[PDB]
Design a protein around this nucleic acid. Structure first.
Ligand SMILES: Nc1nc2c(ncn2[C@H]2C[C@H](O)[C@@H](COP(=O)(O)OP(=O)(O)OP(=O)(O)O)O2)c(=O)[nH]1
Ligand SMILES: [Ca+2]
Ligand SMILES: [Ca+2]
Ligand SMILES: [Ca+2]
Length: 341
DNA sequence: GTTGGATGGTAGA
DNA sequence: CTAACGCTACCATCCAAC
């Protein structure tokens, strides 16, 4: 069983660089401008030239422009990146129809039938890298292992423009030597709970009773980790089904005023609903980010599917209920649909 | 007890 | 306006309901 994971390098900024090759070689920061004020918003991605100066996904545009004034700052054109991505994901389908598109820029390919071994996998990895470079001039990092998790870990270790096989033996080495924080699904919160438990490595999750581990990081994560540590993890490459579609916007300024907020919400509905495309949601959540950036949400799951009209009406009620059960001003308002029929 | 929805936490794209 | 986007997936947990 062999999983080839592809993660496009600095995706958004690279697409920007491919569209505008005069950009390659200098810092490119792809930004999501919130609109509140001059350069309000956050960096979506920066190329590695920008990253060398700490401009990375998540920092405020003004921080980025503080630490990297000269860079090229480009609005995020998510649809453009999605088009390139889909073309690449299609390229990847020509290597394995058994593909899991995990995000805009990463897929797992089960290549067990395409390859007999890690060496052919590697060769396929190179082939895959070249095809995407030929077809889309996008460099990608390839991570090959016996499962998704380690293929992702392989890729993280090889980024950018890398290719890395974690064979069955390194898998066993990494279960023992890899900081468990480096395991996908283990963020800062889980890492810092695993430290407390003295769990620094996947292997340490076997040296602990389930419930004590569970009682810290949760049943699912505990099982996950233990299954990884056991070299049993064998989650299949399954075609992903969007479970939720949503749209959230920053408001020009914070508001507790429904009438000022609604336009944003309805836009989020219009856009969410447009992006549902055929999919009928049974659940709608109005998500509000407050002044202090707490995320608050009120949702409803109807038996049957929600129409755009019912979305408009229910969202306003849910927004009503947010405004009512939380005293804070709302800074971002969004909607999220889910439970598709 | 246990579903499953509401809501939030966490991780990550 | 004064930093903190927007997006999804998964899961924990509370609580009402069954
Ligand atoms: N708006 C926004 N988009 C993000 C964020 N993080 C990632 N993305 C989008 C932009 C990235 O180009 C794309 C792929 O995610 P990655 O984590 O793989 O970032 P990227 O490819 O740019 O770096 P790469 O060389 O893997 O490390 O996902 C984020 O925090 N905000
Ligand atoms: Ca990634
Ligand atoms: Ca990437
Ligand atoms: Ca981590």
């Amino acid at each position: 069983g062999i999983v080839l994971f592809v993660d496009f390098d600095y995706f958004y900024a690279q697409v920007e660089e491919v569209l505008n090759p005069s950009l390659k070689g200098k810092p490119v920061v792809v930004c999501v401008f919130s609109g509140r004020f001059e350069d309000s918003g956050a960096v979506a991605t920066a190329n590695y030239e920008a990253r060398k100066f700490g401009v990375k996904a998540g920092i405020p545009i003004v921080e980025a422009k503080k630490i990297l004034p000269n860079a090229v700052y480009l609005p995020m054109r998510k649809e453009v990146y999605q088009q390139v991505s889909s073309r690449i994901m299609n390229l990847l389908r020509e290597y394995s129809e058994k593909i899991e598109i995990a995000s805009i820029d990463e897929a797992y390919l089960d290549i067990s039938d395409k390859v007999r071994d890690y060496r052919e996998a590697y060769n396929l990895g190179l082939e895959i890298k070249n095809k995407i470079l030929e077809k889309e001039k996008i460099t990608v990092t390839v991570g090959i292992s016996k499962n998704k998790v380690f293929a992702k870990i392989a890729a993280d270790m090889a980024k950018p423009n890398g290719i890395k096989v974690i064979d069955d033996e390194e898998v066993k080495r990494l279960i023992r030597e890899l900081d468990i924080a480096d395991v996908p699904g283990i963020g800062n919160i889980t890492a810092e709970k695993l430290k407390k438990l003295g769990i620094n490595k996947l292997v340490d999750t076997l040296s602990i009773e389930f419930d004590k581990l569970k009682g810290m990081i949760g049943e699912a994560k505990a099982k996950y980790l233990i299954s990884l540590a056991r070299d049993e993890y064998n989650e299949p490459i399954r075609t992903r089904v969007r479970k939720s579609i949503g749209r959230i916007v920053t408001m020009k300024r914070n508001s507790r005023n429904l009438e000022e907020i609604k336009p944003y919400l309805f836009r989020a509905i219009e856009e969410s609903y447009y992006k549902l495309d055929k999919r009928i949601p049974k659940a709608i959540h109005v998500v509000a980010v407050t002044e202090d950036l707490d995320i608050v949400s009120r949702g409803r799951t109807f038996p049957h599917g929600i129409s755009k009209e019912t979305a408009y009406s229910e969202s306003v009620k849910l927004l009503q209920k947010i405004l009512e059960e939380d005293e804070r001003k709302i800074r971002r308002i969004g909607v999220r649909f889910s439970k598709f029929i």
